[PDB]
Amino acid sequence: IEEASFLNGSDVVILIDGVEELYMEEIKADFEQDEQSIKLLGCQNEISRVGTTKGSFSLNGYKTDSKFAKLGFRSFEIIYNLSNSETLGYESIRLKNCRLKKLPLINSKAGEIVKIEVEGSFRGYDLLNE
């Protein structure tokens, strides 16, 4: 019975703006696009087109510094190395011109560990490796 593999999520390594960020817990990023649905005058099947693209991302992790608060709305890059060790074919993706949607200055509850949640957008992406 031949083997398989699940890319465990704990293999993620995120380098935000060059420096390796090591408290991040979950990262999401999608490349949206407006469908631009057009109804033809003779054909009864709607047609979709690329339209224009839009990035969106997010990160959650344990707070350890004011890195994001001091960063402000400055543009920055994000790398995401989804390493695979059962098979050594890691995957690396670069997000270009990441900008925060909202600066998370303060978020904390008394009886809990303080976590930092971020969300924003990016102009474009590059698939460095796969």
Next chain:
Amino acid sequence: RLAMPIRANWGDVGKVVTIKNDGDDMNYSAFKLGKLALLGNVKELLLYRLVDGNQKKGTLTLKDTTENSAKDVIKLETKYPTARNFNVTIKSNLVDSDKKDFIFFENTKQLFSSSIKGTIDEIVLEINSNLDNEYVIATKVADSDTILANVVNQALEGGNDGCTSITNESYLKALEEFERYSFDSFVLDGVADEALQETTKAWVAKNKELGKDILLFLGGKTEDNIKQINDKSKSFNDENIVNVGSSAYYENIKYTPSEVAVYIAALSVSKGITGSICNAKTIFEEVEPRLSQSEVKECLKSGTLVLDFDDGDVIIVDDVNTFKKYVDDKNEAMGYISNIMFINTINKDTSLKRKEFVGKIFNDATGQTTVICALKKYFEELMSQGIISEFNVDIDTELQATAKADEFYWKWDAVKVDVM
């Protein structure tokens, strides 16, 4: 910012000073060649004075006569050290015996005229602070309220002329002082001695290893024909070094190619990256020796910045450098002074990028990709501004293969807009 080593009696010795849009003698470079530097319309000029070591400040001592025994209460000195006959006439005021008229002279023409009561502080501060006392400093000897004696045309003496002896060590003082400052360009003040030019070549090379690619300008002596000019240009091969070929007239002087280099440097600094002097008009009314197509080609290929009166006004035929005697790996676009200054600006900006990405980033493929992407974005921004037309910045594989853990190498190449 042009570093100007004036051979002048006026100006401060051994110190760097700047002048805004605002010497006088034709023999002194503060006006002879300071005019050349200003005519290129650099945003401001920075000056340095070359003087023989055997040169000091003139000193005049004055004594009172209110009491029978005269004692010194005021001493006057030239603003900068000099032996110039800056004569001073002090006489008792016509109405009040307690006020002394102070008349100062450049040589004999009336410069400043005023009078102050006998208290020494008021007199000295008036003489120091008044507008027409630009050519004197006055200092107190002791607290007094007595009245000076009557003296006419007292010459301040004790020093020596600023043009006493322009020699290699005295010239090198300027470079030694300018080591602590950064400029857009530096120019030799006209003395087309090959020893001085070679010393400046070595100095600029030392700075190039340090990275301070201060754009240098030089020129041949009055006795160099086209052959001598071309040979001396071929002697140099540096990118940032220039050899103006032809003498010129502006008002009265047969300015040497080295002296013309001052105005050429000012124009080059003023133009900046955007402006190129390959076909730009110049202030000069005439330049010699004249050059036909063959002479122009021979001088340009030898590394000479050719100036000719090829039309109704003087025209710089091309903005070329000593590296115009190029070598195969670097194209002829490297041989243009504007391109070299553009390269230096990119080197400075990439040094800013260098200090931005110090060893906090790991020496791995990820960090190298980060730095390369930052440089790529910088060149993309420059292309959007329009200066760059193409670029390819990549890992310097030849140097990076043997790179230790701490060191990383990279390299950039880009095409630039042409101007015929």
